[PDB]
Write a protein that binds this ligand. Sequence first.
Ligand code: HEM
Ligand code: HEM
Ligand SMILES: CNCc1cccc(OCc2ccc3c(C)cc(N)nc3c2)c1
Ligand SMILES: CNCc1cccc(OCc2ccc3c(C)cc(N)nc3c2)c1
Ligand SMILES: C[C@H](O)[C@H](O)[C@H]1CNc2nc(N)[nH]c(=O)c2N1
Ligand SMILES: C[C@H](O)[C@H](O)[C@H]1CNc2nc(N)[nH]c(=O)c2N1
Ligand SMILES: [Zn+2]
Lengths: 407, 411
Amino acid sequence: RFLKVKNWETDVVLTDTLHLKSTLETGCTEHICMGSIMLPTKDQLFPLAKEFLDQYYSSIKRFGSKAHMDRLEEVNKEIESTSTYQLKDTELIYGAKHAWRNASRCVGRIQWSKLQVFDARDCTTAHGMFNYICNHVKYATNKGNLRSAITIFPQRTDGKHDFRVWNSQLIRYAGYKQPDGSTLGDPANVQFTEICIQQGWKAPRGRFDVLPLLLQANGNDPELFQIPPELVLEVPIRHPKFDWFKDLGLKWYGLPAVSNMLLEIGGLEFSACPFSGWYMGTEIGVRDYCDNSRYNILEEVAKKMDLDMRKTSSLWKDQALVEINIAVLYSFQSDKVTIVDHHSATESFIKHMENEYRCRGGCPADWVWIVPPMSGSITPVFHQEMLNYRLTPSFEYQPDPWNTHVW
Amino acid sequence: RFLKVKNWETDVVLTDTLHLKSTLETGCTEHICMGSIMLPVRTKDQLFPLAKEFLDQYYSSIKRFGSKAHMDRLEEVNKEIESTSTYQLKDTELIYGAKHAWRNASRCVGRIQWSKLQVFDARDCTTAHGMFNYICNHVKYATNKGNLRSAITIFPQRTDGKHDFRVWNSQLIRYAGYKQPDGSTLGDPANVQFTEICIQQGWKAPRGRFDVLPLLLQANGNDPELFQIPPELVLEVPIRHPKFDWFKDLGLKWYGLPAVSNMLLEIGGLEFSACPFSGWYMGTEIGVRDYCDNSRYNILEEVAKKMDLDMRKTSSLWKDQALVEINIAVLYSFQSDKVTIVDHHSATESFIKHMENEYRCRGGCPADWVWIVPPMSGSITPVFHQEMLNYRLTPSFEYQPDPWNTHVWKG
Ligand code: HEM
Ligand code: HEM
Ligand SMILES: CNCc1cccc(OCc2ccc3c(C)cc(N)nc3c2)c1
Ligand SMILES: CNCc1cccc(OCc2ccc3c(C)cc(N)nc3c2)c1
Ligand SMILES: C[C@H](O)[C@H](O)[C@H]1CNc2nc(N)[nH]c(=O)c2N1
Ligand SMILES: C[C@H](O)[C@H](O)[C@H]1CNc2nc(N)[nH]c(=O)c2N1
Ligand SMILES: [Zn+2]
């Protein structure tokens, strides 16, 4: 029950004890592994509060101190009275950083302690939310020198007063379904693009139209806001060898900022907590550009390369995939917009695993997500055994708002 | 209890009932997933239900469940167990067992082929020389002048664990590896330990970069003996690239016949510790892992140099670019020499169709995503976007310790 993990490229073996602190469940059993499945009250709240506070006061070397006990007492009192409780600023910041630390699917976690936390808990309106989000975006973008950030809106109370950002990312391109049958723009967003238009948005019906924010404060109907264009940094995608590449018409945004997840700290639920870092190249070039149910540009790019697309065994798809990802990295780098290639990021993650095993006793990690979608085994994480388990505080998935919202 | 998996590229949803038949354990708990851990003397006591479960499966597949033939067989095995503490499989049962072991192999992407398996019954074998003869015929049959045929050769089952048959080679055909005094390795670094054993056992090593290893064969618990596969039986392929003529000069070749010989076949509780099986290669097995793993031949550097790529920063993706050409060259060379092979696109597409079929005719298809997804270009193959359920069915192929670690030396 003190588990070992082996790197089969380097024979390095790490011992994991951290997993015994795990509370939440995996979806696996001794009879069946679900490792590749995408999505598996007052009395409830105080153990959760206590556990979080216990680990917080341990992290600041004040375990079993007056200040510890006093706070445990104080929150315990407050839970009894208000049926909920509030996080001290210090606890908020700790919780946020540690949620990221504990994100078993994030390869970028070597950066986990350098997170900028924006406390938006005083927010009351969608316009307010828009202002906080604009400041987030401007701060994180930093004229291309990106900085990790999170903006935390008021915690859930009775589920009828939820703060939600309806967009899946703060910045995403619209998706429209043509009469001719195909799809213009990003097919991942067709349903949301509809709901935007279905709510008032006037679409340019272009291929790369930045979606409007759809913001929901205190459980009210969500409101549309347009992000100032000057705050949305975009990178024109060109190849460093192929001059025809610019003519493909491709660009992407610099800021990956996920906005549909739920942040859980000490049992408190933050349904609206958009957070952002910077991209790994493959996220755009492999997934966003070449996934079949996305921009799926593979065929057109290969045709420009004049490859033998007759037989699959020419690996033309593979060739094109590489070149596309070469371009993406090259474009960002050229415009001094922060980006990391999958070799650099996976090497960082191994060093980070080392650090976490050494200073924390382990690092929960989901091999199925950590290994990049291209060139898997020539990255170090492929040969790295990983233990997946769920630590708290955490980022969790939550239902799409339109399925839930009582209009 | 029913269970659903979803393809996120196609939104196809499948329902698994087959996982209910699963007996063996996964390594996982509700509190931990061991899904990426590589590897997570049996008495009459526990053997009969294992026999009964197998025979129940067997007679179901032949639509004779509860027939007199079924019951008599059950009776027959029962008595034979308590009388002799083990039992023998019929030919039909052995063939069924082998095919289903492959069908149940959740880490194998090539199972669309599972029903076309040539089973060679080598249970009458008694000596290493007899093992060598059987293995020779396997290789010739399977190789078929390049038109590869799946085959498995099954040697006598374990009895008291003190008389095991084992093939000490991990594969029937593999290249030697030699550690040099300067710390570099000549040949295949994956086979250095086993090469050393062979040398110690009296093998005279040519000491080149592609020396086919001798067979080291153990019959009936005896010390293993060395044998050289006749070269004319070992089909090899010079690796060249269709556009890069300097590629031939890298000096690479590979053997055509992937034949794994270190695994254990379990059927109805019986253990077959020597059961070499072979198919044909998926290109990436050679082009990605065998050539480009840092701990293998590791040719990325030389290939990248020869292509004149910007090798100064990794963000140039010179590694990725070289990987692709190398895998192109492997496919090109094999197809040119009419030696059976399959690229990762074809094989993954076939697996999805197989898997879908298995869900409909069988109620499930256990699959290990970590192993099924190819080691390059993962997300542009359709298995990447496919949710999979991993669980263990019998008959099965199992890992077993390396024999040099467990063997009692007679002298
Ligand atoms: C700073 C650079 C960062 C990099 C390079 C990075 C990289 C990645 C990548 C490649 C994924 C795979 C996601 C996918 O394929 O869709 C991922 C997932 C994830 N990241 Fe990170 N990330 C970074 C920062 C952050 C930050 C600041 C947070 C939170 C504060 C975060 C939280 C997460 C979470 C929760 C997931 C999993 C989401 C899910 O389960 O769907 N990341 N990350
Ligand atoms: C006929 C063409 C076949 C193809 C293309 C194929 C393909 C593969 C590949 C690519 C792997 C992963 C190999 C690795 O990365 O080490 C694998 C694993 C495996 N294959 Fe197949 N295979 C074939 C035939 C067979 C046959 C005939 C058997 C047995 C009768 C078999 C049983 C297995 C087993 C048990 C594994 C898992 C090995 C392990 O757990 O370490 N395969 N196969
Ligand atoms: C579509 N894949 C499932 C899914 C659902 C919800 C959010 C998802 O986002 C993944 C994600 C989240 C955060 C990221 C951050 C902060 C940076 C980054 N480079 N990539 C990320 C990637 C993915
Ligand atoms: C050292 N890698 C783990 C390992 C240990 C023992 C056997 C292993 O076999 C993988 C395997 C087994 C059978 C294969 C067959 C029959 C065909 C094929 N193309 N590849 C195979 C690949 C792998
Ligand atoms: C750590 C990890 O389980 C290990 O490297 C696995 C990953 N997936 C694999 N998949 C295949 N097909 N072959 C392998 O050898 C491995 N190795
Ligand atoms: C079905 C499968 O689990 C699904 O495609 C996963 C696989 N691994 C992934 N890995 C990352 N980083 N991102 C993803 O969206 C996925 N999708
Ligand atoms: Zn699992």
